[PDB]
Amino acid sequence: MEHVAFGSEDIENTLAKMDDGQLDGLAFGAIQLDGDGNILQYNAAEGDITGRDPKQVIGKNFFKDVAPCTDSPEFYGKFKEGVASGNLNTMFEYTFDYQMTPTKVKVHMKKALSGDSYWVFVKRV
Ligand SMILES: *C(=O)/C=C\c1ccc(O)cc1
DSSP states (O other), X not given: OOOOOXXXXXXXXXXXXXXXXXXXXXXSEEEEEETTSBEEEEOHHHHHHHOSOHHHHTTSBIIIIIOGGGOSTTTXXXXXXXXXXXXXXXXXXXXXXXXXXOEEEEEEEEEOSSSSEEEEEEEEO
């Protein structure tokens, strides 16, 4: 298993060296989005939590198609502000409840070391 802890201060650096294969070895959910909320990466742990198949949601827009419970001021609003500002680093609990059993998770959104990409990290609480 890849050894990186959820909430690590230098996680964006560690994950920059990871392909889809290594991202799947994380102990927590990991989603990479572009500026518009499109899914570039989606790991196995994220799939075990959300139920959806990794390979089928890549390409999809996270806020419009895949995950609406997130289209609101407390998740999407925070993400859109971060994108426009060029800086993003926030952590909060939330509840995923679309087409699945209501699940409490802890989310960490952070701008990737890369240009126009952003990370969404999920774990159970
Ligand atoms: C609330 O809906 C949050 C996240 C989420 C992620 C994946 C799927 O499939 C549903 C919901």
